Design a protein that fits this description.
It is classed as protein fibril. The structure is a homo-oligomer of 32 chains of 9-residue chains. The first copy, chain A, is largely without helices or strands and 9 residues long. Helices cover 0% and strands 0% of the residues of chain A.
Amino acid sequence: GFGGNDNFG
Amino acid sequence: GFGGNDNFG
Amino acid sequence: GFGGNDNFG
Amino acid sequence: GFGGNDNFG
Amino acid sequence: GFGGNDNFG
Amino acid sequence: GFGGNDNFG
Amino acid sequence: GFGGNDNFG
Amino acid sequence: GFGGNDNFG
Amino acid sequence: GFGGNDNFG
Amino acid sequence: GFGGNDNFG
Amino acid sequence: GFGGNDNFG
Amino acid sequence: GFGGNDNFG
Amino acid sequence: GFGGNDNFG
Amino acid sequence: GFGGNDNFG
Amino acid sequence: GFGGNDNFG
Amino acid sequence: GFGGNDNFG
Amino acid sequence: GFGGNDNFG
Amino acid sequence: GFGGNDNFG
Amino acid sequence: GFGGNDNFG
Amino acid sequence: GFGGNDNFG
Amino acid sequence: GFGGNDNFG
Amino acid sequence: GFGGNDNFG
Amino acid sequence: GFGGNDNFG
Amino acid sequence: GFGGNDNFG
Amino acid sequence: GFGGNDNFG
Amino acid sequence: GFGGNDNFG
Amino acid sequence: GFGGNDNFG
Amino acid sequence: GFGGNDNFG
Amino acid sequence: GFGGNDNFG
Amino acid sequence: GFGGNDNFG
Amino acid sequence: GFGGNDNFG
Amino acid sequence: GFGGNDNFG
């Protein structure tokens, strides 16, 4: 359900 | 032809 | 989550 | 008896 | 000469 | 590129 | 609801 | 095209 | 009792 | 559509 | 996604 | 001790 | 309803 | 001397 | 050198 | 996706 | 460096 | 589908 | 010279 | 621990 | 209905 | 490319 | 009658 | 749908 | 010694 | 590094 | 009675 | 298309 | 395109 | 006489 | 007709 | 990436 370019680090 | 990281349900 | 009769060009 | 393209969430 | 998803009653 | 429930003629 | 004597073609 | 009970002749 | 050029439908 | 002695050609 | 006591007659 | 038809999201 | 060569892409 | 593309009725 | 629906009467 | 009666020289 | 009890859809 | 530290009692 | 998640239409 | 679409020259 | 020495290119 | 009635002496 | 690299996609 | 002389890098 | 995609008549 | 349609004289 | 290198297209 | 005595060098 | 003494960790 | 980890293009 | 020590990348 | 006549003494 998100964009796709994520960085939960 | 669209962005690339999408959510369609 | 969406209607159902959709047109993704 | 209803529309035809429907998502019941 | 119609065309489309339809709901008669 | 066009809608999806069309009547041509 | 509906009856008859119609044309859906 | 037409539809319904009719009476020709 | 009519007569002549005609189209139906 | 139409129907008669439509000489054609 | 719903309370639940629903009726689609 | 709650209703019974619940939508725990 | 219509007539011709047609590039319905 | 007609031509093109015609929808004759 | 021309289009291909021509009607040289 | 083009007209149909063309003269690409 | 995040909590630990998560829902990543 | 939630946080994760829940106590339905 | 570019990322990797591309879409050449 | 970084984005994902990078150009380290 | 035309001359007779034509060059339909 | 020409008419048709030519005379190259 | 054309230069050559040409792309009729 | 593109030119033909490209340097995808 | 010239362009490479040329049209000489 | 460059396009593709070149003529280094 | 003419040059010798002429174009009659 | 052209004269006849041409000297593309 | 970079120095040489790197430590992507 | 120079560093040792270099990137001469 | 150029220098000689060039970079056509 | 560079000219070509260098003297990295």
